[PDB]
Write a protein that binds this ligand. Structure first.
Ligand SMILES: Nc1ncnc2c1ncn2[C@@H]1O[C@H](CSCC[C@H](N)C(=O)O)[C@@H](O)[C@H]1O
Ligand SMILES: [Cl-]
Ligand SMILES: [Cl-]
Ligand SMILES: [Cl-]
Ligand SMILES: [Cl-]
Ligand SMILES: [Cl-]
Ligand SMILES: [Mg+2]
Ligand code: NA
Ligand code: NA
Ligand code: NA
Ligand SMILES: [Zn+2]
Ligand SMILES: [Zn+2]
Lengths: 115, 285
């Protein structure tokens, strides 16, 4: 509810979100889920929706903590693109992108679709 | 048959009438109902809009320019912009705007009243979801700016889709629909119980093709909606295989007024030409 301010006014916004969740707070809502075929490449971050049968596709900016909190990025990789999130994890897309990393060779999420 | 469509267009029979203005029997609020789980109404709505726009002769240049007004939700995100980004060719310039701050997948996002939005450059497609919550007169505000923007900054051959409702409408905008090769009022199947529609102008000609009276045409629109109930449908959302806007590689030419002859107007009408400059795009304020 005040999750965005909570993280925006923390020294470490990513840690703040983790702490907030660990305390029972509800994940950031209104990540923009797209209608898609579910026949895509299954890669993590793409120019258009690329969800496979195990993923959802979301508008990228809405799944970025730093975009959503309107604060500085730690460098955006997501804004302007689409992010594929495992369906089992689609309840917390912002959390997923924070906790996970894209493999630099296959382009899929490490520990989910990556080989 | 109708349930499978992304929505319903105002039939010509109804456009041709000279109806008196009546109250609309529809309410814009509902429980919808046909929106799939985890999907925002606006994602569904814009998806069906783009599905409908796919059936029309839209000019699609190699370096397309699209501006999206009223792109911010009260959620602080841009679901319509996201759909547009999914729909449009990769590398299309997509610029959006809203009075209030929001996070967007557009290339540029302009915050402030739309009247502060200034650009010398012309556009190939204008989308507007702008809306402000005794008589039912023509509304000004953002509509006044929008008509000026279409007249000054829409490329010949370009198209528009502008959201209207029973009470949120403008007479001059309706009149301007007669300056396109074709126009309609389009109701999305997912929001069909609302008086909402998109005024769609296909292939801008920069001059009257027909003489539309704005007050009369809105009365015609309302009469149509009052006498033709449309059952909610999300059928079209379940096949997204052919969704992206077709890459037509539509010619872009900078032509003077005296070069725009009969043959050229015919090309404009058929969705086969865009007329504008190709200078660097600057949008600000
Ligand atoms: N005069 C004006 N100038 C700029 N924006 C306006 C306006 N009047 C209304 N609007 C905008 O129109 C929007 C109505 S809701 C639009 C929803 C948005 N298209 C989405 O994808 O979710 C509001 O965001 C409001 O800020
Ligand atoms: Cl976390
Ligand atoms: Cl389609
Ligand atoms: Cl057409
Ligand atoms: Cl008329
Ligand atoms: Cl051609
Ligand atoms: Mg035609
Ligand atoms: Na067009
Ligand atoms: Na209304
Ligand atoms: Na009149
Ligand atoms: Zn970001
Ligand atoms: Zn890998």
């Amino acid at each position: 509810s005040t999750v965005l301010s909570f993280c925006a006014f923390a020294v470490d916004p990513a840690k703040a979100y983790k702490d907030y969740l660990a305390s029972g707070g509800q994940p950031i809502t209104n990540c923009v889920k797209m209608l898609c075929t579910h026949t895509g490449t299954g890669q993590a971050i793409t120019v258009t929706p690329e969800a496979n049968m195990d993923q959802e596709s979301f508008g990228g900016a809405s799944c970025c903590l730093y975009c959503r909190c309107h604060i500085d990025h730690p460098n955006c990789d997501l804004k302007g693109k689409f992010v594929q999130i495992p369906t089992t994890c689609a309840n917390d897309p912002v959390g997923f992108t924070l906790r996970n990393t894209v493999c630099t060779v296959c382009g899929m999420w490490k520990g989910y679709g990556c080989s | 048959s109708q349930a499978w469509q992304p929505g319903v267009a105002m039939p010509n029979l109804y456009k041709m009438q000279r109806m008196l203005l009546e109250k609309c029997d529809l309410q814009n609020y509902g429980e919808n109902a046909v929106i799939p789980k985890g999907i925002m109404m606006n994602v569904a709505k814009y998806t069906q809009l783009c599905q409908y726009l796919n059936t029309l002769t839209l000019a699609v240049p190699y370096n397309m320019r699209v501006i999206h007004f009223g792109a911010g939700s009260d959620k602080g995100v841009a679901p319509g912009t996201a759909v547009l980004r999914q729909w449009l060719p990769t590398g299309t310039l997509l610029v959006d705007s809203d009075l209030n701050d929001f996070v967007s997948d557009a290339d540029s996002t302009l915050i402030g009243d739309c009247a502060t939005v200034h650009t010398a450059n012309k556009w190939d497609l204008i989308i507007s979801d702008m809306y402000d919550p005794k008589e039912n007169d023509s509304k000004e505000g953002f509509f006044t700016y929008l008509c000026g923007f279409i007249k000054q900054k829409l490329a010949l051959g370009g198209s528009i889709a502008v959201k209207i409702t029973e009470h949120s409408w403008n007479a001059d905008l309706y009149k301007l629909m007669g300056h396109f090769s074709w126009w309609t009022a389009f109701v999305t199947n997912v929001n069909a119980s609302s008086s909402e529609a998109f005024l769609i102008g296909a292939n801008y000609l920069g001059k009257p093709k027909e003489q539309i009276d704005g007050y009369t045409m809105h009365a015609n629109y309302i009469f149509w909606r009052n006498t033709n109930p449309i059952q909610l449908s999300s059928y079209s959302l379940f096949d997204m295989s052919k969704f992206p806007l077709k890459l037509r590689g539509t010619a872009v030419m900078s032509l003077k007024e005296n070069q725009i002859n009969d043959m050229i107007y015919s090309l404009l009408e058929k969705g086969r030409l865009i007329i504008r400059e190709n200078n660097r795009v600057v949008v600000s304020s």
